[PDB]
């Protein structure tokens, strides 16, 4: 789906398989966070369905023994001073030592400041011992999290369930036609993109000789020349687009390890899965009721959230009994109207827009004419897009084809998809909902200078779910977008004592980084929110609390109270409404029990299960149930008469007897059971029609 999902798949520890557990045998004690998982497994990232606790992810610093036991690093301490010697310990060796905590005050020389420190004793017992027994120390505060959980800013302010959903939903994002890096990040995004391997990096040092849209030529210092090719518009395992673009000039000097070309979800070497949007937190006329989302029309007129999707189809020519199939433009039973596309070979032409019913490649199976059939590859119902490429394999030009087949063509079709009602959006903190409405840009609340907002989120869902990291993210995003400057005329203020010297001033559209368990405090945010720079005109739109006064775009009067405004990172999820709509009147049927087929690809019906019959019987609807169970599913003789009656405008007939009952009777009779259907005076009924 995107580089993060591919990287996460290769770091998965699974507890099932031929030699492990079962989804039914496994109980409730194998799905718990043991105290020995600290530094070896991630306690947050886990599936949400029946595999909860049976699948996990390895941590960032973990490594495996030559026996199969996971290790984790520690810093050796002697005489109360932390050294810089790293020793790897397994879970069976760290229960005889006292291990300190990563967030521990350490002086310049390396002596503990606090008299007592929080440690971990033998049986995972947390205690407050006086700092004189410590024997080991952690290497970093993010030692206990995986690679996808270490990409959420302000993680310590979120509940466990919401961080779980955010980590699971970061792997379902789709690549967009244009990418942009987060305004607020974590710092893990740079080495999570190089190690995934979807970018191109340079293996040696040299100068750039030639750059084009599909190749880069690098001349090394010794004399050797190396050329790198690109994958333009390649289809991934899930139908998304994988496109690589160069980000170098024609005279640059390149060092080994430097990123040379971009990738699917990459912006200048770092992973970018979404876009930055201006948010307001307020209810609006009930259009964002119960987790719905309101969007602006500027997100459709400017292609902010648009993704290409590529699909593949194929046909064959397996020599049948009499004669053999041969793909040709000659399809007798069809005219010359629906034949303009097909070139003089029988295949569509690169560039032709297809609908649902168009013929892609035409084949006539013969008998050895007036014997040929209409077997032409068509576009499956509800699918369209331009033909972007063909690939024909033939054995006459010497090729390895499965015996029997003589021709295998593969057609590709791409469609640029936009955003619409029903599409799913998400954030990094657990925010999740479908788009309820898209509004004109003149109908949207706007700031004092006339800037409309891009997305509206409801305020009723935040307090009861305990994910308050999103509001902090919006505050920090506004501060980063606008830019700030701290005054130090009378010395550094008291709240900015611990800030570095490079964070005392920033420019508009700056990029910052807040690590996962050692980042920006709240005094720092409160102090930065009152230092931001003004805009073109000398106006400060957002006051010291992070709130701004908005106007109403439908009535014109200002809203009576200030509203929270900021910037937030929004991703597009791979659950689109165009792939979930379905309907059917009549179609294919089964063979044994003549009920409608199942599934969306086979034009199937919807199951009317057991629980849905109890509601019908409790309502008292005796005729709806009978019609739903006989003349719409199984009554073979009544289906045709019902269709004719509906078309002719007459009354619907009386239902007969279902076929599945007769199948059941023959099943019971095949086990040597003498089951018969009697009448009011004996004289078993035949129950086979035929007269």
């Amino acid at each position: 789906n995107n580089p993060l999902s591919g990287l996460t798949h290769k770091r998965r520890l699974s507890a099932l398989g031929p030699g492990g557990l079962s989804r039914e045998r496994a109980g409730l004690e194998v799905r718990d966070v043991h105290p020995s998982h600290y530094g070896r497994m991630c306690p947050i990232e886990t599936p949400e369905g029946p595999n909860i606790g049976l699948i996990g992810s390895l941590s960032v610093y973990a490594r495996v023994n030559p026996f199969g036991f996971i290790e984790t690093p520690y810093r050796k301490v002697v005489d109360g001073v932390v050294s810089d010697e790293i020793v790897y310990l397994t879970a069976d060796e760290e229960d005889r030592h006292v291990v300190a905590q990563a967030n521990s005050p350490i002086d310049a020389d390396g002596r503990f400041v606090e008299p007592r420190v929080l440690v971990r004793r033998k049986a995972g017992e947390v205690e407050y011992v006086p700092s004189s027994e410590v024997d080991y120390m952690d290497v970093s505060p993010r030692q206990m999290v995986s690679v996808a959980t270490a990409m959420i800013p302000f993680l310590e302010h979120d509940d466990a369930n919401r961080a779980l959903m955010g980590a699971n939903m970061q792997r379902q994002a789709v690549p967009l036609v244009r990418s942009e890096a987060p305004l607020v990040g974590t710092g893990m995004e740079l080495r999570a993109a190089i190690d995934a391997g979807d970018v191109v990096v340079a293996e040696e040092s040299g100068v750039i000789e030639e750059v084009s849209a599909d190749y880069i030529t690098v001349m090394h210092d010794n004399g050797t020349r190396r050329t790198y090719r690109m994958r333009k518009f390649a289809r991934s395992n899930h139908g998304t687009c994988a496109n690589q673009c160069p980000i170098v000039d024609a005279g640059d000097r390149v060092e080994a390890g430097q990123v040379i070309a971009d990738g699917p979800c990459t912006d200048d070497g770092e992973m970018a899965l979404g876009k930055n949007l201006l948010v307001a937190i307020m209810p609006w006329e009930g259009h964002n009721y119960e987790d719905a989302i309101i969007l602006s029309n500027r997100l459709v007129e400017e292609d902010v959230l648009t993704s290409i999707h590529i699909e593949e189809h194929e046909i064959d020519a397996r020599d049948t009994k009499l004669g053999a199939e041969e793909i040709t433009r000659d399809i007798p039973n069809i005219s010359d109207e629906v034949l303009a596309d097909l070139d003089e070979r029988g295949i569509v032409r690169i560039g032709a827009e297809v609908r649902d019913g168009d013929i892609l490649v035409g084949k006539v199976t013969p008998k050895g004419a007036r014997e040929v059939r209409d077997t032409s590859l068509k576009v499956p119902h509800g699918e369209s897009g331009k033909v972007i490429g063909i690939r024909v394999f033939s054995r006459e030009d010497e090729d390895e084809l499965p015996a029997g087949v003589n021709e295998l063509v593969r057609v590709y079709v791409a469609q640029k998809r936009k955003i619409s009602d029903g599409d799913k959006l998400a954030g990094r903190h657990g925010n999740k909902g479908v788009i309820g409405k898209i509004l004109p840009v003149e109908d949207m609340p706007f700031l004092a200078d006339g800037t409309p907002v891009d997305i509206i989120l409801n305020t009723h869902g935040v307090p009861r779910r305990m994910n308050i990291g999103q509001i902090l993210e919006t505050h920090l995003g506004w501060c980063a977008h606008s830019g700030w400057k701290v005054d130090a005329a009378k010395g550094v203020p008291d709240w900015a004592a611990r800030l570095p010297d490079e964070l005392l001033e920033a420019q508009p559209n700056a990029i910052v980084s807040t690590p996962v368990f050692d980042g920006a405090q709240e005094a720092e945010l409160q102090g930065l929110l009152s230092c931001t720079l003004p805009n073109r005109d000398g106006d400060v739109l957002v006051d010291a609390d992070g709130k701004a006064m908005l106007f109403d775009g439908r009535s014109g009067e200002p809203f009576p109270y200030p509203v929270t405004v900021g910037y937030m990172y929004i991703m597009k999820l791979h659950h689109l409404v165009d792939d979930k709509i379905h309907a059917r009147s009549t179609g294919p049927y089964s063979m044994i029990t003549q009920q409608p087929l199942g599934g969306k690809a086979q034009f199937g019906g919807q199951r009317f299960g057991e629980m849905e019959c109890w509601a019908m019987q409790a309502y008292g609807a005796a005729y709806t149930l009978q019609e739903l169970l006989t003349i719409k599913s199984d009554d073979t003789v009544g289906r045709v008469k019902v269709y004719e009656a509906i078309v002719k405008g007459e009354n619907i007939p009386e239902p007969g007897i279902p076929e599945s009952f007769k199948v059941l009777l023959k099943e019971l009779q095949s086990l040597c059971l003498n089951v018969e259907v009697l009448s009011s005076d004996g004289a078993a009924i035949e129950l086979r029609e035929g007269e």
Binding site: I86, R191, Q258, T514, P515
Partner: peptide, 21 residues
């Protein structure tokens, strides 16, 4: 940091790191 060509992303961290992932 530690990458030849990388965007300059300033950080809020107050602790130093003795190991690289």
């Amino acid at each position: 940091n530690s990458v030849p060509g990388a965007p300059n992303r300033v950080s809020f961290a107050k602790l130093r790191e003795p190991l690289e992932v």
